[PDB]
């Protein structure tokens with residue numbers, strides 16, 4: 001439950017399973033900037049430039065995507081996964097990340113990317129801190 005120091009997240013990825021027309025590029029860039037600042041201020045800095053940011057659709061897209069990521073980006077520390085409401089994509093991200101490829105993933109809801117609040121960003125930093133701590 002305690003906050004872990006020493007975490008720096010330099011290589012990370014975004015997979016957006018929410019529809020681009022709903023969660024546009026500027027939503028992603030804005031969400032990301034807000035996340036960079038609060039994680040910085042908290043002392044678990046996530047660098048502002050993700051190594052990869054793409055839209056995907058459907059649970060079947062998850063495993064080919066993570067394979068690509070794992071095959072392409074050495075030192076990949078985290079995949080942030082944006083979800084549009086209740087979706088089987090969540091189950092699949094966890095199956096593949098935790099069980100198949102050993103890749104750390106953190107899911108977040110589309111609504112919290114379209115409009116951030118300090119508290120929802122805080123919730124996310126803590127979930128991330130526990131994971132990589």
Ligand SMILES: Nc1ncnc2c1ncn2[C@@H]1O[C@H](COP(=O)(O)O)[C@@H](O)[C@H]1O
Nearest residue numbers: 083085086087090105106107108109127
């Ligand atoms: N069945 C589901 N469908 C969509 N989103 C989910 C589901 N289960 C959990 N989540 C979201 O996943 C996030 C937690 O992800 P994680 O901490 O990576 O396990 C929470 O913010 C939830 O909103």
